[PDB]
């Protein structure tokens, strides 16, 4: 239903910003492999959020 | 330093469990494309956490 849909969109939005923050922390730490993986994680978090927005936005 | 490293590990652990929860919600909603993407997101969140654990664990 629309409230469950909105929970899921918000959580996708949230997760996308968390992964950006994690990217930033791993770059601040100069942890090169982990940063590269986190950067990919964030790109995928962004893909998920746009797709969830598209359907339930 | 070790406390910054531990912040980053915890946040990776957190993000991994959030993405599993998001996967579960999108499957509960029967939103097939978004679920497939979330499933991939979670696999990547798990890759990040293991790699961060490996380095800073």
Swiss-Prot record, chains A, B:
Protein name: Regulatory protein rop
Molecular function terms from GO: identical protein binding
Taxonomic superkingdom: Bacteria
InterPro entries, alphabetized: Regulatory_Rop, Rop-like_sf
Cystine bridges: none
Gene: rop
Function noted in UniProt: Regulates plasmid DNA replication by modulating the initiation of transcription of the primer RNA precursor. Processing of the precursor of the primer, RNAII, is inhibited by hydrogen bonding of RNAII to its complementary sequence in RNAI. ROP increases the affinity of RNAI for RNAII and thus decreases the rate of replication initiation events.
KW Transcription (keyword) present: yes
Keyword Coiled coil: no
């Amino acid at each position: 239903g629309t409230k469950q849909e909105k929970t899921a969109l918000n959580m996708a939005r949230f997760i996308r910003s968390q992964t950006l923050t994690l990217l930033e922390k791993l770059n601040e730490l100069d942890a090169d492999e982990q940063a590269d993986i986190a950067e990919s994680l964030h790109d995928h978090a962004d893909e998920l959020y746009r797709s969830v927005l598209a359907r339930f936005g």
